[PDB]
Design a protein around this ligand. Sequence first.
Ligand SMILES: Cc1cc2nc3c(=O)[nH]c(=O)nc-3n(C[C@H](O)[C@H](O)[C@H](O)COP(=O)(O)OP(=O)(O)OC[C@H]3O[C@@H](n4cnc5c(N)ncnc54)[C@H](O)[C@@H]3O)c2cc1C
Ligand SMILES: CN(C)c1ccc(O)c2c1C[C@H]1C[C@H]3[C@H](N(C)C)C(O)=C(C(N)=O)C(=O)[C@@]3(O)C(O)=C1C2=O
Length: 367
Amino acid sequence: LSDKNVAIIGGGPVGLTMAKLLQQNGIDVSVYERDNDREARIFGGTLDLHKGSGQEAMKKAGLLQTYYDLALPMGVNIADKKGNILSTKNVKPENRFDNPEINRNDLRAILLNSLENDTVIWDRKLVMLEPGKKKWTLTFENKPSETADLVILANGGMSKVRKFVTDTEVEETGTFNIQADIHQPEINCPGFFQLCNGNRLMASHQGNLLFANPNNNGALHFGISFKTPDEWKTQVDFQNRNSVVDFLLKKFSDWDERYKELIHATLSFVGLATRIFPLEKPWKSKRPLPITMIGDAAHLMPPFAGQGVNSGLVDALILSDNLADGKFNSIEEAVKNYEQQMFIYGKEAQEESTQNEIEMFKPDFTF
Ligand SMILES: Cc1cc2nc3c(=O)[nH]c(=O)nc-3n(C[C@H](O)[C@H](O)[C@H](O)COP(=O)(O)OP(=O)(O)OC[C@H]3O[C@@H](n4cnc5c(N)ncnc54)[C@H](O)[C@@H]3O)c2cc1C
Ligand SMILES: CN(C)c1ccc(O)c2c1C[C@H]1C[C@H]3[C@H](N(C)C)C(O)=C(C(N)=O)C(=O)[C@@]3(O)C(O)=C1C2=O
């Protein structure tokens, strides 16, 4: 049911997957991505696609083998502030396929490559949405505007164009995350690198959490998290390396030298407040033209349970099915139904992520 065309805003994992599953069923899709070009480097850790959810989307796109090829199984160590390993869960073969970590750039290369040529239009930053006659008018910063019968919002948890769908707002969660990458970790943070010993790593002490992957395409990526300091309105300047170091070395004074060394080796930090785009009230049932939201734009949730890209990939799977299989009379019904399902499991996921994030950051939290 499409002698029409679809517009996905944002070429994240979710949006790009969405375009694949539609373009597979003959649907006319374009992806408008903010990024200047495909070789833009995506900051952040590795994604694990679970079987049942994320992996199903890759399977349906016929990319699951590709995902496996590029991915990487990881063990995980739990450590204390002193450097003791408290637990080593290595990977058992056949578990190797349960949730191998993939690099975010690697993943995009897999998705992009799956799409037909010029499916993604780069250097397109969506600023404005206007529901014209029977089409949406899409307005792009310093670029030609465009039109589409259906707009799929897949532009992340901070999307500024959710208005025609819902007026719910992003909330700050209470915790705050500081993330960084270290290159040549074996050289620049040899102590910490060896404590990881090839596995992910997660220590926890007095409401300050640490997480770390020692091998994201040969970059150590770590993240520290904590309940937001009250004195923050974020009253620390993440542009000043030394500002952040000092704040961290204070938070981490009790910890072994190994961790201080990590903080010391970091060239630049990224500050981030945990946010949720809560699935409370239903979305607007009164919409000028066909429009919906998948991925982080639809159910942004704390990054403490490995959901998000999965839920998002599922969003894609469901919506894409619904918009094609023929089992529907109107696009409005097909989106309504995807939104029906997604609300149940999205909320389920948020519940976990919220709960887990409440679980840690307690006075005495065991990993
Ligand atoms: C620190 C941290 C750790 C995390 N760890 C995990 C994890 O381990 N596992 C997991 O599943 N999830 C994790 N998440 C959440 C997860 O990474 C996201 O759910 C996932 O990236 C969602 O993909 P998406 O396409 O919906 O969102 P995004 O990746 O946010 O999609 C953004 C895309 O849309 C584009 N875009 C943005 N704005 C515009 C615009 N105005 N116009 C056009 N294009 C635009 C962006 O350029 C980008 O390409 C984590 C999040 C954080 C912050
Ligand atoms: C232990 N905790 C319950 C879980 C459970 C399941 C998961 O699938 C995951 C976690 C920890 C979280 C920690 C977060 C951390 N932070 C809260 C964002 C974080 O910074 C990192 C990191 N490597 O820096 C993660 O691994 C992380 O993104 C992550 O992917 C996790 C993750 O994959």
